[PDB]
């Protein structure tokens, strides 16, 4: 029986992975393993490992790794703690494949761990471009260390091939997180209001702003000063991720809460069912998260995308791109006030029927 | 003033980097820093960090990291110890540039540390192909996390560009290690004969067969049988480096020395200047060393490469590959006795020229081929 290990280091990536994990678990010919780490064990990010367990999954191996110091040197140390724990976790699990989604620093660490230990990596969401984050270069490094590739669009598949991956190892299966659109039940406004003790019947923005890590001196005051200028709208926040630079954003969020206690809801981390439900009923998805470029258009919610963290990803008409600039942000906010489904199944099929035990040779473009 | 930090994890890669380090040290507008780690602190290799200091360099930061173990799990642990140490080393050094060569796992670790910490990485020898366990993948991951790229040949530069690096960040400068050919004062036959008590004036082969770790059950019978048949030739060589199966070569050579004591010379470690001097006057370089695919061509000395340890390296006129097959080898030896792409050895100065005149503080945008 094939042991498919799924890596997860953040609530949001766990949300994207959910239906693959559920289907592997339900499949009698496959044994799900889970390696959970990074933000799932940090109290500052909600201790979201508890959500994995409550959803009915068994965490095969957990590795706590994040240092609390908010610095780039501490991020590198965290990656080192991660490698030290992954060494023993992968030794014990002995997975037949490790599924790795995305582009975060903990994903880079587990991928090179798996490579060194000859565990084949299946990589989801390669081939994409996010110029303003060091996730950009991480993503392509993870591609180069992975044996098989599940891309979300033909453009992205083509880039993975340009990177020198064999065409027969690259699969355009779509965006796995978008299977939630068909398979997950959404909560109503009344249910959200009871759950968060907050009136979701009043218009609101959903805001997620993460550190833009290639930006030298990030000052997020233009965003919060912009929000303070909008009247008769509530502000619902999720917390920034664990990249260096995030405590500055948390401070700004707490300050806004203190100034507007009845108009601000700070949620360390929504379950992705609740998250998608809150997103669906928002005036707009504000900030610089990838959900603004995927889930928000898919739910027909406008996106106010700020800065360069998402720069290079495919665009569409509902995306308002603006600089980290108070006047540009205010005006985009006002604009928003005034105006297929079987990816999991496809991935499992490929994994069941494809030999990707050995990294294929480099693919030169003739 | 600009702080150029050079990373080194092995004696061999230090030797390749040597003349770039000398030139940075000599240059009054460049401050050399050195981050030494990994195999330089291993007792089985004789603590080669001391060679760096004796060669006249100052080690700015040292990071012990390698675990005493042969497991792949312990390699991953070693890499984690490396990252923990590199975090504080880079924090203290405040390099304007980190120079990183090749594809070892400690080089992957320091490159991602520098990426996260916004230290621009200059990568040497990207775009090359050599199938080991995973050495190829690592090399390309390092490329993707580096800001500027110093390739040894045009085909390698073209592959780096295919990997999505901007053409204006990729430079064919040749192989830095070949600066040793251009800058060495070679020992003469007489000086070599006196130093090693052996007559170099008579024809000889310099072989270098390293323990080909991939070819397990390593039977070098067609290797040495292929040399006892060649008449009127002496056999000179150093020791094969420490891999999984060097004692099968330590004795396969010692076999031939007790058999032909005044026809075979076994050598300590030459050191680069004496090595190139011995190489320069050899009939041909045989074996599977990387020397065979760069240093011997640069000295107009024919090469007979054995096995596939050097597979993927660019071939040219001077080179003739053979199987580990007794007959195919001898045919190469016998009238190999009849007889530019990696540059001539000015690579260090080309690199420094580019570094002084190019802005590479940020990673350039991904380059889509049209
Ligand atoms: Li299953
Ligand atoms: Li200097």
UniProtKB/TrEMBL annotation, chain A:
Positions that bind UDP 4: 210, 270, 275, 290, 309
Keyword Hydrolase: yes
Record CDD domains: GTB_UDP-GlcNAc_2-Epimerase
Hydrolase in keyword set: yes
Residues holding UDP 2: 210, 290, 309
Entry EC no(s): 3.2.1.184, 3.2.1.183
This protein's UniProt keywords: Glycosidase, Hydrolase, Nucleotide-binding
Name assigned to this protein: GDP/UDP-N,N'-diacetylbacillosamine 2-epimerase (Hydrolyzing)
Matching InterPro entries: UDP-GlcNAc_Epase, UDP_GlcNAc_Epimerase_2_dom, WecB-like
Gene designation per UniProt: neuC
GO molecular function: nucleotide binding; UDP-N,N'-diacetylbacillosamine 2-epimerase activity
Residues of the UDP-N-acetylglucosamine 2-epimerase domain: 23-352
Species for this entry: Acinetobacter baumannii
Any one GO BP annotation for this protein: UDP-N-acetylglucosamine metabolic process
Domain of life per record: Bacteria
Residues that coordinate or bind N-acetyl-D-glucosamine: 125, 128, 139, 290, 313
From TrEMBL, chain B:
Binding site for UDP 3: 210, 270-271, 275, 290-291, 295, 309-310
Annotated UDP 4 binding sites: 210, 270, 275, 290, 309
Alphabetized GO MF terms: nucleotide binding; UDP-N,N'-diacetylbacillosamine 2-epimerase activity
Listed SUPFAM superfamilies: UDP-Glycosyltransferase/glycogen phosphorylase
InterPro entries: UDP-GlcNAc_Epase, UDP_GlcNAc_Epimerase_2_dom, WecB-like
Positions bound to UDP 2: 210, 290, 309
Sequence positions that bind N-acetyl-D-glucosamine: 125, 128, 139, 290, 313
Top-level taxon of origin: Bacteria
Biological process annotations from GO: UDP-N-acetylglucosamine metabolic process
Enzyme Commission (EC) number: 3.2.1.184, 3.2.1.183
One Pfam family named in its UniProt record: Epimerase_2
Binding residues annotated for UDP 1, in chain numbering: 11, 210, 270, 290, 309
NCBIfam families: NeuC_NnaA
Name this polypeptide is given: GDP/UDP-N,N'-diacetylbacillosamine 2-epimerase (Hydrolyzing)
Organism: Acinetobacter baumannii
């Amino acid at each position: 029986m094939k042991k498919i290990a799924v890596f997860t280091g953040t609530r949001a990536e766990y949300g994207l992975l959910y239906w693959l994990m559920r289907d592997i678990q339900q499949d009698p010919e496959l044994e799900l393993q889970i390696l959970a780490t990074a933000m799932h064990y940090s109290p500052e990010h909600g201790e979201t490992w508890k959500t994995i367990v409550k959803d009915g999954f068994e965490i095969t191996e957990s590795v706590e790794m994040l240092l609390s110091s908010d610095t780039s040197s501490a991020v590198v140390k965290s990656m080192g703690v991660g490698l030290l724990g992954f060494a023993d976790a992968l030794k014990r699990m002995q997975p037949d494949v490790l599924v790795v989604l995305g582009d975060r620093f903990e994903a880079l660490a587990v991928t090179q761990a798996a490579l060194i230990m000859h565990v084949p990596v299946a990589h989801l969401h390669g081939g994409e471009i996010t110029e303003g984050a060091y996730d950009e270069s991480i993503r392509h490094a993870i591609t180069k260390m992975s044996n098989i590739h599940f891309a979300a669009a033909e453009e992205y598949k083509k880039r993975i091939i340009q990177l020198g991956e064999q065409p027969e190892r690259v699969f355009n299966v779509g965006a796995l997180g978008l299977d939630h659109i068909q398979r997950t039940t959404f909560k109503s406004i009344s249910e959200l209001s009871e759950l968060y003790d907050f009136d979701f019947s009043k218009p609101y923005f959903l805001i997620t702003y993460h550190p833009e890590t290639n930006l030298l001196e990030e000052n997020v005051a233009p965003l919060f000063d912009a929000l303070k200028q909008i009247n008769d709208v509530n502000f619902i926040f999720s917390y920034p991720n664990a990249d260096n630079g995030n405590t500055n954003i948390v401070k700004a969020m707490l300050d806004l809460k203190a100034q507007l206690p009845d108009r601000v809801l700070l949620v360390k981390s929504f379950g992705i069912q609740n998250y998608l439900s809150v997103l669906k009923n928002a005036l707009a998805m504000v900030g610089n998260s990838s959900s603004g470029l995927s889930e928000a258009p898919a739910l027909q919610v406008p996106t106010v995308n700020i800065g360069d963290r998402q720069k290079g990803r495919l665009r569409c008409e509902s995306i308002l791109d603006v600089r980290l600039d108070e006047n540009e942000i205010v005006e985009a906010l006002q604009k928003a006030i005034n105006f297929l489904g079987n990816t999991s199944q496809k991935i499992i099929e490929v994994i069941k029927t494809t030999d990707f035990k050995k990294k294929a040779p480099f693919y030169d473009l003739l």
